[PDB]
Ligand binder design. Structure first.
Ligand code: HEM
Ligand SMILES: [K+]
Ligand SMILES: [K+]
Length: 378
């Protein structure tokens, strides 16, 4: 496994810690950037670093259309500006009752199944996908078929005939939804965007964007819920931060994102020209991989970065990236994580590992760290 994907419990592995701020490693020829200063520079200075997979404009592959991470300015600048109406603060406030209802249903399922039960299978793996459907406006009756089509086109256990057949039905439903939404836009993700930029944004872009959001906000949030619940059980005096006001909980959630930093790396950058980084020159065309988990344990970011402390004041961590590509789902993640953790200990105040000796089953195969299962009792 690539060294930048190795964890040791909640922490980056020792051999990852042993790599410098900036070193060349092999996957080929690629820089590993691990300091906080150095990572902020690579992620923000889009004047010297491109994210495009090495092909702009009409010549961009269909699989990357609508994926802002493959866009540089000014192409990036246009599409992100055009999606901004779907992420207003009014949007988040209306989604909150819907996230509360989704969280309650999953707690009910856990409470119906009786203890002990798998938190990952019944709670952490179900919420983020239902939340995303609310975001983009999938009908409430189609949530189950939609998630089937969404996972179906990527299930590596399926053949090329099966996955491609499911991928074609996926692109039909969205194009159906967008054209249906375009002809009569109410309030929602598609509706808010086309009512304001209907002439500037194509259905191919709007389809591409909806697909990419499903992929952007699922593995990351489910990972956060599992690791977060286990993080609090291992630091039991910090559960109290989830039993007060919203400021106390929001502060805890943002510390949990930084401490756990579920994604191993952001999109690879390519040097557009010779650029100085940490007293070393990166030649044009060379690749730079960023370790977000090492960046968020950098003791320049904060002393005792390796300790979890949900009462501490937020700091400029890079778990959501930095600069123009900063996670478009950040506010949504903060909201739904606050609703989930808070509701969980409110329904099950006496939550605990079902058996403290059980093995911890870490998710290591996906782009986001997490757990594959977690039996608990209450
Ligand atoms: C635990 C939750 C999440 C984490 C830790 C996370 C992490 C990140 C990171 C590190 C980036 C920067 C990519 C780069 O610079 O290469 C990013 C970008 C992005 N995220 Fe997230 N993400 C999360 C949830 C979500 C959700 C829920 C959504 C959508 C609902 C989302 C949508 C996006 C999009 C579209 C981008 C591309 C932004 C751009 O280039 O303009 N993310 N995310
Ligand atoms: K995913
Ligand atoms: K993983």
């Amino acid at each position: 496994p690539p060294i930048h994907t190795r964890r040791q419990g909640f922490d980056p592995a020792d051999e990852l810690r042993a790599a410098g701020t900036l070193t060349k490693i092999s996957i080929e020829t690629t820089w590993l950037a691990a300091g906080h200063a150095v990572v902020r520079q690579v992620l923000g200075d889009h004047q010297q670093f491109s994210t495009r997979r090495r092909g702009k404009g009409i010549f961009r592959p269909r699989e990357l259309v609508g994926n802002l991470m493959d866009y540089d300015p000014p192409e990036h600048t246009r599409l992100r500006h055009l999606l901004t109406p779907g992420f207003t603060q009014r949007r988040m406030r209306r989604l909150a009752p819907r996230i509360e209802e989704i969280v309650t249903d999953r707690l009910d399922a856990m409470e119906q199944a009786g203890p002990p039960a798998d938190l990952i299978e019944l709670f952490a793996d179900e919420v983020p996908g239902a939340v995303l459907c609310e975001l983009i406006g999938v009908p409430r009756d189609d949530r189950d078929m939609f998630m089937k089509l969404c996972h179906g086109h990527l299930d590596a256990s399926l053949s090329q005939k099966r996955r491609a057949a499911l991928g074609d039905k996926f692109s039909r439903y969205l194009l159906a939804m967008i054209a249906r939404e375009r002809k009569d836009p109410g309030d929602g993700f598609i509706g808010s965007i086309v009512a304001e930029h209907g002439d500037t944004i194509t259905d191919e872009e709007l389809r591409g964007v909806c697909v990419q959001l499903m992929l952007a906000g699922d593995d990351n949030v489910s990972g956060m819920i599992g690791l977060g619940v286990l993080a609090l059980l291992r630091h039991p005096e910090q559960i109290a931060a989830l039993r007060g006001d919203d400021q106390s909980a929001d502060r805890a959630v943002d510390e949990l994102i930084r401490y756990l930093t579920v994604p191993y790396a952001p999109t690879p950058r390519t040097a557009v020209e010779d650029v100085m980084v940490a007293d070393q020159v990166i030649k044009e065309g060379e690749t730079v991989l960023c370790s977000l988990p090492m960046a968020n344990r950098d003791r320049a970011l904060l002393p005792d970065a390796d300790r979890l402390d949900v009462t501490r004041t937020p700091v400029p961590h890079v778990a959501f990236g930095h600069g123009i590509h900063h996670c478009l789902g950040a506010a949504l993640t903060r909201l739904q994580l606050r609703i989930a953790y808070t509701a969980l200990w409110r329904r099950f105040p006496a939550l605990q590992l079902a058996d403290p000796a059980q093995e911890i089953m870490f998710r290591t195969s996906t782009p986001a760290y997490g757990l594959t299962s977690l039996l608990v009792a209450w």
